[PDB]
Design a protein around this motif. Structure first.
Motif, PDB file in Angstrom:
ATOM      1  N   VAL A 115       0.851  -1.173   0.000  1.00  0.00           N
ATOM      2  CA  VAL A 115       0.000   0.000   0.000  1.00  0.00           C
ATOM      3  C   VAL A 115       0.898   1.237   0.000  1.00  0.00           C
ATOM      4  N   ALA A 116       1.867   1.282   0.916  1.00  0.00           N
ATOM      5  CA  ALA A 116       2.760   2.426   1.023  1.00  0.00           C
ATOM      6  C   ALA A 116       3.671   2.586  -0.190  1.00  0.00           C
ATOM      7  N   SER A 117       3.789   1.519  -0.968  1.00  0.00           N
ATOM      8  CA  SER A 117       4.699   1.581  -2.081  1.00  0.00           C
ATOM      9  C   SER A 117       4.036   1.943  -3.405  1.00  0.00           C
ATOM     10  N   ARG A 118       2.746   1.731  -3.478  1.00  0.00           N
ATOM     11  CA  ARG A 118       2.074   1.966  -4.736  1.00  0.00           C
ATOM     12  C   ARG A 118       1.819   3.445  -5.076  1.00  0.00           C
ATOM     13  N   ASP A 119       2.056   3.802  -6.340  1.00  0.00           N
ATOM     14  CA  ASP A 119       1.798   5.170  -6.784  1.00  0.00           C
ATOM     15  C   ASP A 119       0.285   5.431  -6.721  1.00  0.00           C
ATOM     16  N   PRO A 120      -0.148   6.328  -5.824  1.00  0.00           N
ATOM     17  CA  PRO A 120      -1.581   6.626  -5.702  1.00  0.00           C
ATOM     18  C   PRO A 120      -2.237   7.163  -6.985  1.00  0.00           C
ATOM     19  N   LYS A 121      -1.427   7.681  -7.899  1.00  0.00           N
ATOM     20  CA  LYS A 121      -1.968   8.253  -9.121  1.00  0.00           C
ATOM     21  C   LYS A 121      -2.133   7.187 -10.190  1.00  0.00           C
ATOM     22  N   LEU A 122      -1.150   6.304 -10.309  1.00  0.00           N
ATOM     23  CA  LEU A 122      -1.246   5.218 -11.277  1.00  0.00           C
ATOM     24  C   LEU A 122      -2.169   4.123 -10.737  1.00  0.00           C
ATOM     25  N   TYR A 123      -2.317   4.052  -9.434  1.00  0.00           N
ATOM     26  CA  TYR A 123      -3.157   3.034  -8.844  1.00  0.00           C
ATOM     27  C   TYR A 123      -4.606   3.355  -9.087  1.00  0.00           C
ATOM     28  N   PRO A 155      -7.325  10.227  -6.273  1.00  0.00           N
ATOM     29  CA  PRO A 155      -6.712   9.159  -5.481  1.00  0.00           C
ATOM     30  C   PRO A 155      -7.049   9.164  -4.012  1.00  0.00           C
ATOM     31  N   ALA A 156      -7.622  10.251  -3.521  1.00  0.00           N
ATOM     32  CA  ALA A 156      -7.964  10.288  -2.107  1.00  0.00           C
ATOM     33  C   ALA A 156      -9.050   9.220  -1.825  1.00  0.00           C
ATOM     34  N   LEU A 157      -9.804   8.876  -2.863  1.00  0.00           N
ATOM     35  CA  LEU A 157     -10.864   7.873  -2.772  1.00  0.00           C
ATOM     36  C   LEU A 157     -10.292   6.458  -2.579  1.00  0.00           C
ATOM     37  N   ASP A 158      -8.984   6.301  -2.764  1.00  0.00           N
ATOM     38  CA  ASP A 158      -8.367   4.995  -2.547  1.00  0.00           C
ATOM     39  C   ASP A 158      -7.787   4.926  -1.161  1.00  0.00           C
ATOM     40  N   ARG A 160      -1.373  -4.023  -5.757  1.00  0.00           N
ATOM     41  CA  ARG A 160      -0.647  -3.126  -6.656  1.00  0.00           C
ATOM     42  C   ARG A 160      -1.385  -2.748  -7.933  1.00  0.00           C
ATOM     43  N   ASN A 161      -2.489  -3.410  -8.248  1.00  0.00           N
ATOM     44  CA  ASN A 161      -3.171  -3.131  -9.520  1.00  0.00           C
ATOM     45  C   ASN A 161      -4.631  -3.510  -9.358  1.00  0.00           C
ATOM     46  N   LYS A 162      -5.477  -2.512  -9.561  1.00  0.00           N
ATOM     47  CA  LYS A 162      -6.905  -2.667  -9.405  1.00  0.00           C
ATOM     48  C   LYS A 162      -7.460  -3.779 -10.265  1.00  0.00           C
ATOM     49  N   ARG A 163      -6.987  -3.903 -11.489  1.00  0.00           N
ATOM     50  CA  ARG A 163      -7.506  -4.959 -12.344  1.00  0.00           C
ATOM     51  C   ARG A 163      -7.193  -6.316 -11.793  1.00  0.00           C
ATOM     52  N   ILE A 164      -5.924  -6.540 -11.449  1.00  0.00           N
ATOM     53  CA  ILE A 164      -5.536  -7.824 -10.902  1.00  0.00           C
ATOM     54  C   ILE A 164      -6.310  -8.021  -9.624  1.00  0.00           C
ATOM     55  N   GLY A 165      -6.393  -6.928  -8.844  1.00  0.00           N
ATOM     56  CA  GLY A 165      -7.110  -6.960  -7.585  1.00  0.00           C
ATOM     57  C   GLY A 165      -8.544  -7.446  -7.705  1.00  0.00           C
ATOM     58  N   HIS A 166      -9.239  -6.845  -8.667  1.00  0.00           N
ATOM     59  CA  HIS A 166     -10.624  -7.140  -8.974  1.00  0.00           C
ATOM     60  C   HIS A 166     -10.770  -8.639  -9.213  1.00  0.00           C
ATOM     61  N   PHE A 167      -9.956  -9.173 -10.104  1.00  0.00           N
ATOM     62  CA  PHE A 167     -10.100 -10.574 -10.298  1.00  0.00           C
ATOM     63  C   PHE A 167      -9.689 -11.408  -9.081  1.00  0.00           C
ATOM     64  N   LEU A 168      -8.559 -11.051  -8.444  1.00  0.00           N
ATOM     65  CA  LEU A 168      -8.116 -11.771  -7.244  1.00  0.00           C
ATOM     66  C   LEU A 168      -9.323 -11.883  -6.299  1.00  0.00           C
ATOM     67  N   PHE A 169     -10.083 -10.788  -6.190  1.00  0.00           N
ATOM     68  CA  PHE A 169     -11.260 -10.758  -5.314  1.00  0.00           C
ATOM     69  C   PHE A 169     -12.260 -11.888  -5.684  1.00  0.00           C
ATOM     70  N   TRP A 170     -12.717 -11.847  -6.942  1.00  0.00           N
ATOM     71  CA  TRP A 170     -13.688 -12.838  -7.401  1.00  0.00           C
ATOM     72  C   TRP A 170     -13.174 -14.275  -7.363  1.00  0.00           C
ATOM     73  N   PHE A 171     -11.938 -14.507  -7.796  1.00  0.00           N
ATOM     74  CA  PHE A 171     -11.318 -15.830  -7.773  1.00  0.00           C
ATOM     75  C   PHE A 171     -11.208 -16.405  -6.361  1.00  0.00           C
ATOM     76  N   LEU A 172     -10.796 -15.597  -5.371  1.00  0.00           N
ATOM     77  CA  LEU A 172     -10.743 -16.136  -4.029  1.00  0.00           C
ATOM     78  C   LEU A 172     -12.168 -16.400  -3.542  1.00  0.00           C
ATOM     79  N   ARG A 173     -13.097 -15.478  -3.832  1.00  0.00           N
ATOM     80  CA  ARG A 173     -14.490 -15.610  -3.343  1.00  0.00           C
ATOM     81  C   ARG A 173     -15.248 -16.799  -3.908  1.00  0.00           C
ATOM     82  N   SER A 174     -14.828 -17.178  -5.105  1.00  0.00           N
ATOM     83  CA  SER A 174     -15.376 -18.296  -5.825  1.00  0.00           C
ATOM     84  C   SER A 174     -15.072 -19.585  -5.037  1.00  0.00           C
TER      85      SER A 174
END
Length: 839
Positions: free
Chosen positions: A45-53, A156-159, A448-462
């Motif tokens: 979290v502390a390492s990720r660019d809040p703007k690119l994230y 990015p404040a929304l993240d 580190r990446n919302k897209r990967i994150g999004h899927f990681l979410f669904w895949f684990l939840r599955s």
């Protein structure tokens, strides 16, 4: 605190499981894992660019394939830049930057901002050539224009992330077993087998004497093994089985704190129905009331040059070249071990080498680590996913061996992490412990990446929803992820969960009121619309992201266009209006909601399809597959993407031929009547040749080619594509109608059919170039995806299908012959497809 109680509450609802539950635990490995994963998260979290994230640019470093430059035959790219109502087209070269393009935009009308794909949460930013943006390649590939809106960057404040706050032989006492109900047919005997496992490798084995299978069977016996306590390798499993095989359960002989297990244990076992990932779980059965249990007592603690000859070298090399599914002889393992320092210089030997290590020997394991400290060659080898994945399967329980595998995954760019994400997540079921290098790697890339994150979410939840064997481990990892994805992500996931949860309940009721009766009367439909009405209120959120297409936003439910499909089960056909005002077409979002289907199996097959496409891309090929969106939400329930303007090959036949009666020209007649212009018809025929070949090859390799006509679909635009993968003969579907569309019939020939044969070949031998990657993906898919698979025969298929051993010429030939069998079969198999599946 107090607000922590509510926060843990929302997470529980997001996860679909309360990670703080201890009703099914015999230690604190989960809690320990929840603690240990706090650091990896915080650091990322502390390492990720809040703007690119916030703007998740989706890019790739791979070169533009040859088939895409064909489009840009002028070194110029056209991008339509909208604003409010006035659009402006700007020409741009393949290597420019969205910023440069931005600037080169105000230069046309000079008389802060970012480029966002119209009607899509996809941004084109960062120091990257526009040719390297996925959406651009997507448009280039589908001959669509690139429309982008000029708007403000998300805040990015929304993240924002919420602030957190001995040298004796080992032995085990088998006290006995006990199960509530017993009254069964026969009155056979029963005994308990105890094996010390490690990497699917049975180190030692002991058994109790047989006894009358009563409600309670006691032995109170010590089973002493011929293996010293000092020699137990970390990761080793105490595997307990009941034969009379009926029940199994596992226990890590060494805990997460490098400590030997000890004390009394009462483990609730898993049953078996009529070798697979569940078989390896350390979790015990949550059902205490009707499950079998076994009592044991653990009473036994820290954890501490010659150049190879010419001929032998040739032998070692043959082994190394051998396919992953080929067994290693005792002599193979001794050769690989004694010449391990030579083996170490062949990255493609590692799996074989490490599967030659005597893990039940402290000294040998000790030397292996010393060997691994001589990484050099491995650290510099070009990353090979196939090789990497092999070190992550069921055969390796060593933390360090697996660690190096992960170490290589670290080089993958986001684009590749997305290609293997589901298989990487599935591989977590092979980890002996909850907290592992793979789990942290996944946790980090998702954060580190919302897209990967999004899927990681669904895949684990599955998995958490349908897998009692691993939901606990997967829940802890999903939690750790949700705690750092950001408030915005948390909001979106809440929106999605609420919608699927509401649609799941709706599908249940409706499904109930109609058995195996294909009807769908105005009654069921009415009662279906009636419920969507309620949801259309203060329930169904204003919008939500389409789980299989994170970039798209779904709005209100177009209840009118909603209904129930005829299908055997009760599919729910829903359509939504795009929530984005800047969208191109008024087109609605079609999503199917199904219940009673192994959706996880389809997910696996669709990802493999997306992987074969990428393989072909590395070789300038576009087989035009169409791996439609599909996310498994619960047990047998989930949603499916509705492709636009598509029907089954069967329904096209049903359209002319009639009910069950098969004509050869129906298909071609259909494409010609759907194509707006001869130019489009020709293009549709061309797309058909390509898509038909890609699926014939793709389906053959995966051994799911023998299909019924009703499971094959096609777009008005000529794109053929299989569906319903959820679990005389023919290699694949290449019927007279497909051939007629190519201009052939009755063992004849044609310019298009010939094109089809060459493409097939070129495509087939492109998958062979990655035989190992495919064998390993196919092998893992079975163990973690389907019910039960043969520790041989099943997996072994892909080998014969990939014609392992043969040269390209024999392979080319081999495939072409398969094309002929289909030619011979004509309509036979299709007509036969009424009976059932076997063999």
């Amino acid at each position: 605190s107090e607000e922590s109680q509510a926060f843990q509450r929302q997470l529980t609802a997001l996860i679909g499981y309360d990670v703080t539950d201890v009703s099914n635990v015999h230690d604190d490995e989960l809690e320990f894992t929840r603690r240990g994963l706090v650091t990896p998260r915080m650091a990322e979290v502390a390492s990720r660019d809040p703007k690119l994230y916030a703007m998740h640019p989706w890019v790739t470093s791979k070169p533009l394939p040859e088939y895409l430059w064909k489009k840009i035959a002028n070194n110029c790219i056209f991008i339509v830049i909208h604003r409010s109502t006035t659009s402006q087209t700007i020409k741009v070269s393949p290597d420019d930057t969205p910023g440069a393009i931005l600037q080169s935009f105000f230069t046309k009308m000079a008389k802060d901002f970012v480029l966002r794909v119209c009607g899509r949460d996809e941004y084109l930013v960062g120091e990257t050539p526009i040719k390297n943006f996925q959406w651009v390649r997507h448009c280039l590939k589908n001959g669509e224009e690139i429309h982008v809106v000029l708007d403000t960057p998300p805040d990015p404040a929304l993240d924002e992330v919420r602030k957190e706050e001995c040298d004796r032989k080992f032995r085990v006492k088998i006290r006995g077993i006990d199960i509530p109900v017993l009254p069964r047919n026969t009155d056979l005997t029963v005994f308990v087998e105890a094996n010390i496992q490690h990497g699917q490798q049975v180190l030692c084995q002991r058994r109790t004497s047989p006894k009358p299978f009563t409600e309670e069977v006691l032995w109170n016996v010590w089973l002493e093994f011929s293996i010293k306590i000092k020699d137990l390798p970390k990761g080793a499993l105490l595997n307990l089985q009941i034969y009379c095989l009926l029940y199994y359960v596992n226990l890590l002989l060494i805990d997460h704190r490098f400590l030997l297990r000890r004390g009394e244990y009462v483990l609730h076992m898993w049953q078996i129905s009529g070798f697979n990932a569940d078989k390896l779980t350390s979790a015990t059965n949550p059902d205490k009331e009707n499950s079998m249990s076994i009592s044991i007592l653990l009473d036994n603690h820290p954890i501490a040059r010659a150049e190879m000859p010419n001929q032998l070298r040739k032998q070692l090399e043959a082994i190394i070249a051998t396919d992953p599914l080929n067994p290693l002889t005792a002599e193979d393992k001794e050769l690989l071990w004694h010449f391990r320092y030579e083996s170490l210089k062949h990255p493609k030997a590692y799996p074989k080498l490490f599967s030659s290590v005597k893990w039940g020997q402290q000294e040998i394991v000790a030397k292996t680590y010393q060997l691994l400290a001589r990484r050099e060659v491995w650290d510099q080898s070009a990353l090979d996913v196939g090789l990497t994945m092999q070190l992550l399967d069921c055969n390796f329980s060593d933390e360090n061996v697996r660690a190096i595998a992960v170490q290589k995954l670290e080089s993958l760019e986001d684009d590749d992490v997305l290609h293997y994400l589901l298989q990487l997540v599935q591989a977590v079921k092979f980890e002996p412990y909850h907290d592992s290098a793979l789990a942290r790697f996944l946790l980090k890339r998702g954060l580190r990446n919302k897209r990967i994150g999004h899927f990681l979410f669904w895949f684990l939840r599955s998995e958490i929803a349908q897998s009692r064997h691993y939901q606990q481990r997967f829940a802890v990892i999903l939690e750790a992820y949700l705690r750092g994805c950001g408030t915005a992500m948390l909001h979106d996931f809440t929106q999605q969960v609420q919608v699927i949860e509401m649609l799941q309940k709706v599908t249940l009721d409706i499904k109930s009121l109609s058995a195996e009766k294909y009807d769908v009367s105005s009654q069921v439909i009415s009662q279906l619309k009636q419920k969507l009405e309620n949801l259309q209120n203060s329930q169904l959120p204003e919008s939500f992201r389409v789980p299989y297409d994170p970039g798209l936003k779904a709005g209100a439910l177009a209840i009118e266009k909603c209904k129930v499909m005829a299908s055997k089960k009760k599919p729910l056909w829903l359509e939504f209006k795009c929530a984005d005002p800047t969208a191109l077409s008024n087109e609605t979002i079609g999503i199917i909601f199904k219940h009673g289907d192994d959706l996880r199996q389809d997910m696996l097959i669709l990802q493999i399809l997306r992987i074969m496409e990428s393989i072909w891309e590395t070789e300038s090929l576009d087989l035009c597959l169409l791996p439609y969106g599909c996310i498994s939400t619960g047990d047998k329930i989930g949603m499916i993407e509705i492709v636009k303007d598509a029907t089954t090959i069967a329904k096209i036949q049903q359209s002319t031929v009639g009910n069950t009666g098969f004509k050869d020209e129906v298909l071609n007649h259909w494409l010609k009547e759907k194509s707006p212009t001869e130019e489009k018809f020709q293009a549709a025929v061309e797309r058909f040749v390509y898509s038909c070949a890609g699926y014939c090859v793709a389906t053959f390799v995966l051994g799911i080619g023998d299909r019924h006509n009703d499971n094959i679909m096609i777009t008005e635009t000529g794109n053929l594509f299989h569906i319903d993968f959820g679990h005389e003969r023919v290699p694949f579907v290449l019927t007279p109608d497909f051939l007629f569309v190519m201009g052939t019939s009755g063992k004849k020939t044609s310019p298009h059919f010939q094109k089809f044969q060459d493409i097939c070949v070129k495509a087939y031998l492109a998958l062979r170039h990655h035989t190992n990657l495919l064998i390993i993906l196919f092998s893992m898919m079975l163990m973690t995806g389907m019910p039960q698979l043969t520790s041989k025969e099943d997996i072994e298929y892909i080998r014969d299908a990939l014609t392992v051993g043969k040269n390209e010429e024999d392979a080319k030939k081999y495939f072409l012959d398969q094309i002929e069998v289909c030619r011979d079969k004509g309509w036979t198999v299709q007509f036969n497809w009424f009976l059932h599946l076997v063999l």
